[PDB]
Symmetry: D2
Subunit: 321 residues, 4 copies
């Protein structure tokens, strides 16, 4: 049945983070929202709505199976967003990435299952699941091994999610965002770095031959998809790739786009890459269109400008090298 996103108890693991903070902003006026988060990151505390009457912060680890079961009782929409995704974090501690992502998802599924009240379980996976298949434990550089580690940790969570769907009829939705950019993101990914350089006409360096592919999704597009995924009955039992087919580019092509759209004079320079990466193919987004009725509306030019606007407005809150 269609779910109306008002008057619901919404439980969000990882809810202190970027995506979770964003979704809270959008739903908190009309719903009780409980964040379950170990505050490894805390985007949420810096929002207007951090102290809303409808908002609860439970500090907890998804690896604590007992605590997540209790905290999730009565919840009607369960959103599982807690994870470790950082490449450098994964180089250093692959065990923590694997464990948090695989066992955390098991634990979240079990909590949702035991609650008995969950009308939608939404599991955040990742697009790199697709590319990951053409590599092997048996068989790249530190970056590549860490990206593989991340991807397979998320794939294992999808497998668990499927088993709960099949065995228990848990109403699951697997949600795989392309890399999200936009206002709100502080971060040190290519878009935020390159916009910041371009705005000041600083040199932009391309590590490698610049032909590596990255797909993006603008923040507001990802959120619109998420509301559909959380609501429409056709999402249940289904997996979705969430992004913009028009926002798939090479890193060199991204640098040219950003400099062009911002009227930047930045010079773009080729450097040697610091580590070999693995090449992953970008998945198709048609099923999101077909079943969620979702088609991304914010193309790169618009998205990059809106992002550059927010970065300039908020230029006192980061620094990098």
């Amino acid at each position: 049945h269609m779910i109306e996103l008002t008057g619901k108890k919404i439980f969000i693991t990882g809810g202190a983070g970027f995506i979770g903070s964003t979704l809270i902003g959008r739903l908190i006026e009309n719903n009780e929202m409980i964040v379950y988060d170990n505050l490894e990151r805390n985007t949420l505390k810096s929002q207007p709505f951090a102290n809303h009457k409808n908002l609860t912060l439970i500090q907890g680890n998804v690896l604590d199976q007992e605590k997540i079961i209790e905290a999730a009782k009565g919840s009607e929409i369960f959103i599982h967003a807690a994870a470790i995704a950082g490449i450098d974090n994964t180089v250093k501690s692959p065990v923590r990435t694997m464990t948090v992502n695989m066992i955390g998802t098991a634990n979240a599924l079990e909590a949702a299952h035991q609650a008995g009240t969950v009308q939608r379980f939404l599991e955040f996976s990742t697009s790199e699941v697709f590319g990951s298949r053409a590599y092997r434990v048996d068989e790249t550089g530190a970056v590549g091994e860490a990206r593989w580690t991340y991807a397979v940790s998320k794939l294992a969570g999808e497998h668990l999610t499927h088993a709960y769907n099949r065995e228990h009829g848990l109403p699951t939705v697997t949600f795989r965002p392309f890399n999200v950019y936009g206002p709100g993101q502080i971060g040190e990914g290519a878009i935020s770095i390159m916009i910041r350089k371009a705005l000041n006409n600083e040199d932009i360096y391309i590590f490698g031959d610049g032909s590596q592919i990255r797909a993006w999704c603008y923040v507001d597009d990802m959120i619109d998809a998420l509301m559909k995924a959380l609501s429409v009955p056709q999402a249940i039992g289904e997996s979705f790739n969430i992004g913009n087919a028009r926002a798939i580019t090479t890193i060199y092509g991204l640098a040219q786009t950003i400099c062009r759209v911002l009227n930047s004079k930045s010079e773009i320079i080729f450097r040697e890459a610091l580590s070999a990466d693995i090449e992953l193919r970008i998945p198709n987004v048609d099923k999101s269109e077909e079943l969620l009725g979702f088609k991304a509306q914010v193309d790169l030019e618009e998205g990059l400008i809106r992002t550059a606007d927010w970065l300039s407005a908020n230029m006192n809150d980061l620094p990098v090298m």
Copy 2:
């Protein structure tokens, strides 16, 4: 890092089962051995060394992280054999298969890591990991049996992934060991070879379910044990994954039935019947690395191994 397999403290999760019991038989005279098993199966009890002074049985679940950490203290060789591999059980409860295999393996690795004394950690995976890449979680529609086999395969592959992480991050001296299906004396068994030998010996009909073209790879018990001894000892095993079996003992089900009936001089008829459930197609992996690095090459082919198995089955 050549390990001599005497005078060691050996800890074996799932040690009450078929492979654990069999390996204990070979090591118990010269080693302190600890079994950690919840006794879903218990082959060990039927053995004559069940009550050896060198043997301790700890009844516990690999999901009980505290208990397994404690039980594994001081262990010098850690063998993780506990798992759920049953197709019918995995049909009924895929969550239990995934949980026991993935989380049980996580807990086993953590217990080995925490012990600090482990010289070799050997994790039992499964050959179907290789086939499983052909399929997609969001594509499954496979039949019940095929979805169950896939579920089992991916649960094992997650285990391998965890194992890799511990090796890379903490230097845990790991070996991933993927046995082809094991047959021979000591498995009374329930899979095709055991069933088909028993039928053939009494000239009963052997029914082939579906088109008979499904591939199964096999390994004779003594070959698998030999490989395991190499994997537990030899320094080249550390950080590697091995497919353990016999490249001459890969056959179709129809082919297997023909082979069993010829070799045993059976008068059984072999008769086609409808399949009960669709299954997944799995490619069999290469066993070459096992020769190169462990010095292991299986010596018992099907003709010899089927006869040895039938002799045992008749005598019992």
Copy 3:
């Protein structure tokens, strides 16, 4: 749609094994022209070799002018001329590629210019699908002589399929692509594994298994293949389609095949492993469900029965 009586039939490679066999079934009711260079000649040994309805033209499919001329007025055009040479002592990839690729082009063009063709049936091979997993620039002692010759054969047939498709799409030539699994049965001695192992088994001679014996081969009994052929040549929904023609129950390993042969024929032959003479490649066996659904074909002769029929023919003919 097409009733296989009163038709003008033109068959390249008609002197060969499958061509000969098909001629037995149609020659009573159809005018048939065989276009063949007689590199092989099964036809000359058959009772109908000199039938009033049969005309032989000794010609090469690489002689573009002759085949166009010879094919004039044909209503059913069957392109069966091909070579393989996978296991041959003297490897000739050029011969295989030119005969199969260009021979197919010249046949298609002969069919197209006659204007009269209602059905064009091209023989391909099941190996075309697996072939895509290998790359021409990455062929090694990985591949071996037999591997490379099997790849040569497969890609020469795949090119023929592409040609056939182009003629279908551009010119509306009514084409059918027919991919027989390896055919065995009465009518020829043969040099394949079934023939060789049956002859050994009948004399209790040792059977040797090259490599590890786990190589898979799929087999189709001759009568089943001819039944599929008759349906492909007639039924309307065959046009513009490709078919994998086999028996799902006769897909086995070479060792399992040996064991089956010895058991079925009550032989005392030993079966012994030996190192392979040459490295081979691995090619997937495609699914046959569409053939059943669209042609209404399902193979009815399983290996036990087929091996007995074959062995009886071999014993009576030697």
Copy 4:
């Protein structure tokens, strides 16, 4: 075994088109050159060396087996460039595409073989080889017709010892041709601040090779003995980009005010993987020197002047 590209008898099928004209321009001063072309295209007749004393034009079809065999007699370098290529030509007929490319290569190979004198046979293939309207049909047809030519080339090398090189250029661009490709149209539009249309989601990859790099690669392949029996991907690893990315690059590099606008494609995307170019560096000592920025500017300069 290193071949010196002077004083040779060079036979080029398809020598009247773009790449053939270009190569003739570099070699005609110092070699006897025979062009074997049916003149479906004829860039050559526009060139100052069209009537050079060292150039003989034979107007012929690579489908005429006996003629090409005769014409190629005594040839020391055999360059097989004859093909139905460019969507303008290939869209016309899948049959003609498949036939000229596959059979034409077979015939070229047989001509080189029968000559007995060929020290290098260079076969042009296409980078699409290892990737449903008339247009998608003609591209697929082109790709497999070229892959079939690679197969025949292999067979000849293996069986007869023919000293073959399979040469697979990325899409060639640069001065000396208005052109028909994306770079051509997009630069023209950009130079006029004319809006550029992107059909589909614009994610389609295209890799490029600057004409002068392609020619430098071709010279190495024709001479260096390590080229024999090999297949090469010839292009610039830094000049792989999406169609949308290319449009952004052209507009920025040329300071254009063109808008880049998405439009509908009823066609389905072809996700071609782009091959690796390392072997060319290792074996030919070839690495592309003209990157996109520089190439686009030289292209724009030529287009402007003309």
